Design a protein around this ligand. Sequence first.
Ligand SMILES: [Mg+2]
Ligand SMILES: [Mg+2]
Ligand SMILES: [Mg+2]
Ligand SMILES: [Mg+2]
Ligand SMILES: [Mg+2]
Ligand SMILES: [Mg+2]
Ligand SMILES: [Mg+2]
Ligand SMILES: [Mg+2]
Ligand SMILES: [Mg+2]
Ligand SMILES: [Mg+2]
Ligand SMILES: [Mg+2]
Ligand SMILES: [Mg+2]
Ligand SMILES: [Mg+2]
Ligand SMILES: [Mg+2]
Ligand SMILES: [Mg+2]
Ligand SMILES: [Mg+2]
Ligand SMILES: [Mg+2]
Ligand SMILES: [Mg+2]
Ligand SMILES: [Mg+2]
Ligand SMILES: [Mg+2]
Ligand SMILES: [Mg+2]
Ligand SMILES: [Mg+2]
Ligand SMILES: [Mg+2]
Ligand SMILES: [Mg+2]
Lengths: 99, 217, 94, 99, 203
Amino acid sequence: TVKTGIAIGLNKGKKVTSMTPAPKISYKKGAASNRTKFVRSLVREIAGLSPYERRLIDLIRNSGEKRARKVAKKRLGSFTRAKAKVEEMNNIIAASRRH
Amino acid sequence: MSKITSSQVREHVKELLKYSNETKKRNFLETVELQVGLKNYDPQRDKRFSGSLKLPNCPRPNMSICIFGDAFDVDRAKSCGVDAMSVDDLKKLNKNKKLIKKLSKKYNAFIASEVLIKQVPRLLGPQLSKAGKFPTPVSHNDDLYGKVTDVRSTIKFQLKKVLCLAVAVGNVEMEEDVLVNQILMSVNFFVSLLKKNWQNVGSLVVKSSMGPAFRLY
Amino acid sequence: RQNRNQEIFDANVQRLKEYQSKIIVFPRNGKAPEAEQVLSAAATFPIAQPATDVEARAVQDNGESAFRTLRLARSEKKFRGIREKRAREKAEAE
Amino acid sequence: NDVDPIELVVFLPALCKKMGVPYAIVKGKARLGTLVNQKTSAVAALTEVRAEDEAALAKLVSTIDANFADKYDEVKKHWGGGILGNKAQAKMDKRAKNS
Amino acid sequence: GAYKYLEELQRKKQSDVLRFLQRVRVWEYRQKNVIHRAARPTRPDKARRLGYKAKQGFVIYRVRVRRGNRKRPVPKGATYGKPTNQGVNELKYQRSLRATAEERVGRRAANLRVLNSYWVNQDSTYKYFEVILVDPQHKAIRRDARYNWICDPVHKHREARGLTATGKKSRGINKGHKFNNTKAGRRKTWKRQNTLSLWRYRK
RNA sequence: GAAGAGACAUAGAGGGUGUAGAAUAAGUGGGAGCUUCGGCGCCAGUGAAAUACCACUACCUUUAUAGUUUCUUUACUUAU
RNA sequence: GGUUCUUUGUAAAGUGCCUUCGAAGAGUCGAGUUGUUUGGGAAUGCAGCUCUAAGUGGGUGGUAAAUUCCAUCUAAAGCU
RNA sequence: UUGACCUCAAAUCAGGUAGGAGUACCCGCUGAACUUAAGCAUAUCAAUAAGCGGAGGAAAAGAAACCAACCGGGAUUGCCUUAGUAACGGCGAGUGAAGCGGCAAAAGCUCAAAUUUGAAAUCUGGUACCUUCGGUGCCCGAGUUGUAAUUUGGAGAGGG
Ligand SMILES: [Mg+2]
Ligand SMILES: [Mg+2]
Ligand SMILES: [Mg+2]
Ligand SMILES: [Mg+2]
Ligand SMILES: [Mg+2]
Ligand SMILES: [Mg+2]
Ligand SMILES: [Mg+2]
Ligand SMILES: [Mg+2]
Ligand SMILES: [Mg+2]
Ligand SMILES: [Mg+2]
Ligand SMILES: [Mg+2]
Ligand SMILES: [Mg+2]
Ligand SMILES: [Mg+2]
Ligand SMILES: [Mg+2]
Ligand SMILES: [Mg+2]
Ligand SMILES: [Mg+2]
Ligand SMILES: [Mg+2]
Ligand SMILES: [Mg+2]
Ligand SMILES: [Mg+2]
Ligand SMILES: [Mg+2]
Ligand SMILES: [Mg+2]
Ligand SMILES: [Mg+2]
Ligand SMILES: [Mg+2]
Ligand SMILES: [Mg+2]
């Protein structure tokens, strides 16, 4: 936030007049565009689902989130990707169920 | 996290209270029911509790509550619209367990006093815990009307072998705003304390006393 | 490199205008006069350490106890996490 | 209908259906190429015609829609292949008759 | 364009459509020779973003490489030394199968220069790669300043010296604390760190 | 692919021990009618339990459907 | 230096403000495991096999993990 | 019958190119043991010798998926230093970097992802003539399964 003027503590350091530089165009490298969202949605509906994605949707429908996330962590390599993949499969499940 | 959407449950109520009042009328008081079905839960081994949750308003203004205490509590009962028996009558009456059940069922619930904390469960308690309403001491200086009006809206979450614990939140005659806030807080607190939280509960039930079988979830 | 320090940004902009004042850019198709090549730009425009303070001024003692200040800064940082945790649990209790 | 690799066009019927553009799968990248002065075009499209051809375009679009876009939802559900060779098919229908 | 659809579609390798194409193609490649010229890239979008151009002087080859470990090629598994070097079977080549694929394609077409390469397919026995090559003698490349860099002799057999994308990955050429041993070239770093530096006026 | 059998989810289906209230009573509180019936529960007896109504079904398979796929042998042919 | 080609240009480049946008590399990242290697220590890089992503995403932040932030860059293509 | 297209061939077809040598230095792969540990197997020697493949006048690296935690630096390389330090190690013998700081030298950039679509605007080759490290016209071909122009994140594009 703002430096406290002394050498230790939470916001330690020298108080200086700040400038807030203009945002770099990088730092948006991971941003969904309208083109990418359209293309990914079309490819999703063309290609369908992977065998492990179908297993995950069955797991969500049957045992729930915890067991789905465990298998998703196994199939992917990490818990953060397991979670993101499972709320993704939740979205396909919800969209298929509604209407 | 509140999985239950108040935006949808409010219009579910707005399309159900009309059913229970205007299009299908019944002079007999209609009582709104709330049932919660579990998923992957074992009350036999897991912790079991008799939850109590006070609601903002009284569900039914015609309920029967009985106080045990001395003559003072007996006379104040008439100033609070409740009944009260003596002590020596039930001392000489404790022998028959079937009569204790017969006097149990006439009243929805019982409360006691502090002079009788150590003695009422010894004689009255055996056949009274079968109904499931544990009596509570009420003091002479403590307002009897205030205590009863506190316990009128209490919600008994008596966890037992059956996973469909039916408790009535209230009626349709009263306003809907408090009823919606009632069902939102009751479910939110119970799910909050649940060990697996939202994943524990499997079903949600909001019922009209004569309405058909409608499943919200 | 990014600018987040106004003092450094002003110093560099003053550096740039000062350099512009002391160069001659010969035209791409002019006469291009000789201008006595100076080998070092760095020696022409040396980097100066700014002035931190004045040589002398008034003693202002407010009884703060600078040592106490350092100790308390260390303690508040060391105990922020636990104190926020006890605050959060105390708030959530009943 | 004969582009290799088929990945280049395999999304085109879906894209045309999504965007409401009438399409026809037609025999011959060589045939498409000969109408654009190439050896192979792999795709051809009309974005506008003259008044003397607007009716012909409309009637042909109607027939092409009845054949490709109006069947897209059903065609998307049906797997090709699984056809047998001459000898296997013979030896299958003899055992269908025999037992 | 279509390349964005191709790029997204190629990432769905275990969908029905790509699984079917994969099985048909892997059979086709196995029937052909271990190394053979490809008439065109089977992944036009992937070839493009590696620098392929649809013009005279750009060549695609297809090569398959045997999968697995590098068995130490000693007689009867007899390593003659300490037990730490007795291993024969669980030993790994320090360059990838993609590097082996480029090296063999470059040897077959030593008149060309390997630009890059990409995966197209695998089965249990082989991995299948397509290698992008450029003709440095071809005028369409010798002109055209965007590609006549590959005409300089310093780019002879880049894949042999680890100068392609898989080469630099295998060599460890990357910035940061993770690549201290291999940033400027590990053997060059090892020499510099094991050199005794002596000055005229000794320090 | 199959004889197909599970198992999973996606709808319906029914019934059920002792006692006796007023009836083969497996679970809740509700407090008295919507109803062709004045039948049924109710302020009444009573049994562990109130009994119309299950809200879910505490419990199922006895059976039907497409979603799945544990298989268990079995067949297929195009990979090998 | 100097001599010419002198529509030798409506040809190219740059610059301000507003609005809408801003495509950015997949058997790759990453993970498990095996081997090797490193000062890199619950794993420094490399390589084989299995699994295999996302798009306010992804990598890194020298102790494994969950939750919450923050900082810092923008890989899987290339020349000097 | 015929004319394409795709793929695959043949020719002492037109024009080219690779090989081998040298290898001090350079880029990789493969890879020891003697030795030390007062024995010895991990370790050490050593990511070395030998062996294999590939370059140039230098090579490689190189314009951050960097370092940092600062009031922040700012491609790469090399030197002084960090430092025989953090760390690794029968935690034995031994081994062992990096950031910051001062210097030498300094230089920045290019594609893929975008409809030219009122016009493939792009290129090899053959041939003829010339001002011949090339140019111009003509023709055949390549190329839309995408060659030019336009943009590369520092941005930048479209429109006004
Ligand atoms: Mg040893
Ligand atoms: Mg071995
Ligand atoms: Mg170089
Ligand atoms: Mg090292
Ligand atoms: Mg000296
Ligand atoms: Mg990138
Ligand atoms: Mg090795
Ligand atoms: Mg080692
Ligand atoms: Mg920074
Ligand atoms: Mg080397
Ligand atoms: Mg010894
Ligand atoms: Mg010795
Ligand atoms: Mg010895
Ligand atoms: Mg070593
Ligand atoms: Mg040697
Ligand atoms: Mg030479
Ligand atoms: Mg030099
Ligand atoms: Mg380079
Ligand atoms: Mg950059
Ligand atoms: Mg630097
Ligand atoms: Mg020192
Ligand atoms: Mg180690
Ligand atoms: Mg060593
Ligand atoms: Mg421009």
